[PDB]
Amino acid sequence: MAAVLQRVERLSNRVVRVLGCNPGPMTLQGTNTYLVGTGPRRILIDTGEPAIPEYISCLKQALTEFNTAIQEIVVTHWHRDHSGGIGDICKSINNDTTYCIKKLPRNPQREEIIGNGEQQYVYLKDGDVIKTEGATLRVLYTPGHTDDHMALLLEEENAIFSGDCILGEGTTVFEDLYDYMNSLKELLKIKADIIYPGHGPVIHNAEAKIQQYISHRNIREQQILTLFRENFEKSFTVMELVKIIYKNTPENLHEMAKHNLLLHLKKLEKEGKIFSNTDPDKKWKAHL
Amino acid sequence: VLQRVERLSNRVVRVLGCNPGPMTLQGTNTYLVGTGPRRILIDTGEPAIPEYISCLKQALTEFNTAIQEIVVTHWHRDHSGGIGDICKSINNDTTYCIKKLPRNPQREEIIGNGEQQYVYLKDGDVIKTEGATLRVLYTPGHTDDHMALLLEEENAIFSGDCILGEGTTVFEDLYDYMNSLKELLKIKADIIYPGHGPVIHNAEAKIQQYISHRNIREQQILTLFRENFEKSFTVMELVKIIYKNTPENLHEMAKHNLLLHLKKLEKEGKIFSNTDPDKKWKAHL
Amino acid sequence: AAVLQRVERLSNRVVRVLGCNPGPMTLQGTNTYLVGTGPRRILIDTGEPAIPEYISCLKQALTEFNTAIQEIVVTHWHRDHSGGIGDICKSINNDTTYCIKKLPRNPQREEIIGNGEQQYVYLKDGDVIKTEGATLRVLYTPGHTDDHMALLLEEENAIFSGDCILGEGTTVFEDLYDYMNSLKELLKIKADIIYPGHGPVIHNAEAKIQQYISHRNIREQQILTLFRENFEKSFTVMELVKIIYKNTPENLHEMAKHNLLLHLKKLEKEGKIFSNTDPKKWKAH
Ligand SMILES: [Zn+2]
Ligand SMILES: [Zn+2]
Ligand SMILES: [Zn+2]
Ligand SMILES: [Zn+2]
Ligand SMILES: [Zn+2]
Ligand SMILES: [Zn+2]
């Protein structure tokens, strides 16, 4: 049932997609790296995984086929399927000048090493604009997936490069559900026409997908709150909650359920709906 | 010469990491524990060894089984390095659950691309599979996160790099290392499945060999200090005296070994150091 | 640009093995050197990680010049100089494990070699590394990196400059103040030859170091003149780039902005210019 994506493909007058050639459980058909612009120098969004020689061949084929070169490299987040190929591109895709690699900083800030260590990131900020011939990209800070997660708005198409915030097929993972839901709510306000995700096919129904993503998490949150508000006098452990909430989940997915539940509890805790205690087996309980 | 895929018992299959080297001997010993269609995998080899993934696929096909979960002894890249490779190459219905002890003090530990996370265990935790029960044994010394596992059905220890099947191992803290060896002795295990080298059938004799080896050198160092209790010694003074029968090409190994021994005796309040630019060591009393 | 052959005897004491890692920052590749005249020699730098071609070249060099590795000396932490450590240990067979020497990071940091079981032996400025037919004095040259080590081959009056001085073109650095100071220190050595980390051999050492000093000093004079002429004015990084880097194209704006900031941090450290706490403007002092 998963779509078979081609290694090099012209998606629009301004976007060309090169597959990372790194399929897997977390990357789907591979990392979707994009060449944005209409001129002889284009912006490269993401670089795939480290040491994938097939991607360098595909990237060289796209640049030759579309008679273009890399202007600069923009990385959505630190995950190695988006930032791993930076060193490989610098060494293999010959250029007059060294490449400029832009990214959002880590939150809190951290030293991030590129290649051998002589190359450094140029850090951007929310609302920054990246310009090329025929394309203007506005930087949209979308934390949740990662603390440095950057989505980009292609103004000329009203298109979003969502990175790993929104995927072309299936759902995604995140570190913080509170920031993730807030980023989805912010992307909704852009009212974008198309989403170019970090993995999976192109999304033509942006509003419906983001709303599907919000509803999926909200239904589970409503289930968890109902349990707490119906049993206000009980302090529940994670194991207690997992057995009640994820009753329709098999035992082989216990650790995934436990992890999902904790992401939901940290969101409700941050919102002040539930409080935890300092017990060795941490207990959660409804307040007020 | 260890063969790459081998059934060691009714519950254990050894898959070699295909990463031989000075520190890994013939390669990392990874083990498939259990008797059912889903087994526990202990250690994963090094990063980017495609030969190991082929050997692991051969074992799973040969023994008509699959991975239930992955258990990592310690953070060293010959033990935790192949996780990303297994997740990408050994196809499964669900993503793998990777279990390990936390770092001490705690640290962020990145698996693969960064989207996979460790499920952290604690000392005494039990990992169950069809036909096998593994008790988690915290054995620090080699590393601050080192885990040994007790296979209850065989009274067997998966020692990781705490105990090797040939020669000795390295460690960070001699005090914790010696304490872990003393703890493993109390288990009174029948067999040891080490992280490198062949299987150990006389567990008691091997752990006692490891303890005695370190204790002989500690006794030599302590005797020098307690006999010359009014004297203070520099590291270079002590290396020339203690490691007299060791060649000059092994000087840095000797100096390193001595310092590991001196930090244990210092922790034990048997010796004390001073604030001199060339640090001097004297017996306590 | 000169075409360097992979294995070459440059001296009665020095033999160079190319890293087989050409690129924008490494030129024709990392220059790794075998120093000494005996059956055991010192290896300066190890190339990049996972370059199988380099291990073949290194094995050819050791066979051709009937020698072996005594110890490994790393100029700095950059992966094109410390990357091949694990590959050499695994592939170039030896009786004992290799001793890998380096200067510490400043401030100190955990530095992982290979799988994690190997550790660096840290040196200090002025330390001497001896082999049959060669004596190397450790020269702490920070600037390029905070751990950067240059070495003086006493018999030849030669400098293994690492990434401080390159055979062709310019180099990059983290701190211009320390970099300029290290170049001034290397000038005092009055070396005959310079064996760089990348590029061909430097036969006119004085002229090369003075070319490297003059290149940075011309730009510093340009910046300082702008500040001293407009002593009442305060400038931002964007204001200063547009004025100073007038002869730099818009495609190199981020490189210019980065270069400028390295120059401003040196002048700030020297108390020639001062910054403010504005959401940032530099003014004369
Ligand atoms: Zn991704
Ligand atoms: Zn991601
Ligand atoms: Zn090991
Ligand atoms: Zn180990
Ligand atoms: Zn360097
Ligand atoms: Zn270099």
Author numbering:
A (entry chain A): 1 to 288
B (entry chain C): 4 to 288
C (entry chain B): 2 to 280, 282 to 287
Paper text:
(C) LACTB2 is a soluble protein.
LACTB2 crystallized in space group P 1 21 1 and diffracted to 2.6 Å. and showed no evidence of oligomerization in solution. β sheet sandwich flanked by helices and loops.
